[PDB]
Amino acid sequence: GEIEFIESSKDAGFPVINTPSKTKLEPSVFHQVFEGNKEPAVLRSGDPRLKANFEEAIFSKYIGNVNTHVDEYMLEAVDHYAGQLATLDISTEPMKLEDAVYGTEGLEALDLTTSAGYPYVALGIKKRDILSKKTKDLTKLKECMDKYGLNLPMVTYVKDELRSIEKVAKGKSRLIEASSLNDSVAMRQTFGNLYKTFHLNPGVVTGSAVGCDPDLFWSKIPVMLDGHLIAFDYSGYDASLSPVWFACLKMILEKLGYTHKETNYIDYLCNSHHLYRDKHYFVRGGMPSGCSGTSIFNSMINNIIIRTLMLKVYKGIDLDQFRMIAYGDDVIASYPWPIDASLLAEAGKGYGLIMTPADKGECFNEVTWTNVTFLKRYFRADEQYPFLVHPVMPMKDIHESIRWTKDPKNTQDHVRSLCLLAWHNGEHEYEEFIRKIRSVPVGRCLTLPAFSTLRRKWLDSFG
RNA sequence: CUCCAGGUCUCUCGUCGA
RNA sequence: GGAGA
Ligand SMILES: Nc1ccn([C@H]2CC[C@@H](COP(=O)(O)OP(=O)(O)OP(=O)(O)O)O2)c(=O)n1
């Protein structure tokens, strides 16, 4: 990922974009009961907690690119992953517009509560001015698409969210890229059946966890990844993808039946253009976080990436015995033999990728089923039914969430949802949690689910 | 006097119906 | 800046 060019938006006929600088996160009634290290992310240059240049820091994610060709490893990598995807009958036929916009089995409708992006964001137009789920109208949509076209700039905002205290101090707030309604629709039309087949089939064939429910799915995972575990973390994956990985992705899209016409939408992702406040700029490489397809294409690329590193580092390796599940940058995998992920990291570095030891730390340790995480959840088998596995979100991360709110009107929903995460920590931990919640006047006013009821419904789901 | 801040997945709750 | 009660 690299910013090639910056220009004034006026110069390029673009309006200045209103980008919020005030967080919506307030300390909650539970802010004191529990301990936490996160505060809301820095959103402006005048933040008193800033110990570094803000605008320098938020964009620092664009580490650079590496100029390499699609090498013999990538190519093999692609043919292998493609051969899996071929077993699924991914239709390259464009999705019916009513389905691409207002949802179908395997693909939910557009988020109508979010920005419509450029140009509408500066015309003061909301998604709901153009769409209604209730009416399923496409009239105003086609109109707007005719008028404004495709490949519009993506609008860059800072994400309102909690960050570690060093990420607050270092200004490493996160950027997202608001994709225009038009582009989201066009991509969903073009790639809807791919999205759908992916969501309806998470596992070791797609190599994707997208569409799974950790409650039900954690039990399936150790069966699928029966070998020795492989797991690492990425630093700024999305921003680290050089163009060659996109070339790889286009090539696998081509294998699947996609025309050069349709693969060209990948070009709008790799080579993208953005609005940020009063500037218009160009990024070469990097997956733009916020485009349509970001989870699916990030994941497909990860399947190509890890396959490549293996084929490269361990020359003569049998990928028919390799198994991986990716969720964007997040990956859990296994191979029948011990693989040194520090070496896969060294290789990764040569392709622009920064891979680090899993779940923080400074050794590429053994990855056991004990310490491995996926989607931030640990794996624990039931003590009573050892083939059912618990997705275990650390209580410390649940704690971080409850200590804040964006609106106390939601405290009941918020806490209930937190409960459905916490209980997989066990009865001891859940009741301590329910106690600490109850240790505060407002906590005594909430309907909390009983552990016994949670465990019951869970066991009941496997039926 | 409010609103402006992306893609998605999962779950949950609210309302309305068979 | 724009949209609205
Ligand atoms: N609002 C968000 C937050 C995250 N993500 C996706 C894109 C990248 C992926 C990883 O994000 P995190 O791991 O949660 O961020 P981090 O580990 O703190 O920072 P980094 O991406 O540098 O590892 O999640 C997203 O699409 N939208």
Numbering used by the authors: 1 to 463
Can you quote the paper on this entry?
The replication of positive-strand RNA viruses relies on virally encoded RNA-dependent RNA polymerases (RdRPs) that are capable of rapid and processive synthesis of the 7–14 kilobase viral genomes. To examine this in further detail and to validate the polymerase–RNA interactions seen in the initial poliovirus EC structures, we here present nine new coxsackievirus, rhinovirus, and poliovirus elongation complex structures at resolutions ranging from 2.1 to 2.9 Å. All the complexes feature an upstream RNA duplex that is pinched between the pinky finger and thumb domains such that the RNA exit channel is opened by ≈4 Å as compared to the polymerase alone structures. All of the complexes show the open conformation for the active site wherein the β-strands of motifs A and C are not hydrogen bonded together to fully form the RMM-fold that is commonly utilized by polymerase active sites.
Soaking the CV_r2 crystals with CTP results in cracking and a low resolution dataset (≈3.4 Å) that is not of sufficient quality to elucidate structural details, but soaking with 2′,3′-dideoxy-CTP (ddCTP) leads to a 2.7 Å resolution structure (CV_r2+1) reflecting one translocation event and a second ddCTP bound in the active site. This complex is stalled at the pre-catalysis state 2 of the catalytic cycle because the primer no longer has a reactive 3′-hydroxyl group following the first ddCTP incorporation event. The two polymerase molecules at opposite ends of the dumbbell remain essentially fixed and the translocation is accommodated by “peeling” nucleotides away from the end of the duplexes at the RNA-RNA junction so that they become disordered in solvent channels and are no longer resolved in the structure. There are minor perturbations at the end of the RNA helices as new non-canonical base stacking and hydrogen bonding interactions are formed by the nucleotides that have now been translocated into the junction regions. 3500 K composite SA-omit maps contoured at 1.5 σ are shown for the CV_r2 complexes where soaking with 2′,3′-ddCTP results in one incorporation and translocation event and the binding of a second ddCTP in the active site. In contrast, the coxsackievirus 3Dpol CV_r2 lattice accommodated one translocation event upon 2′,3′-ddCTP addition by keeping the two ECs within a dumbbell pair essentially fixed while unraveling the ends of the two RNA duplexes at the junction point.
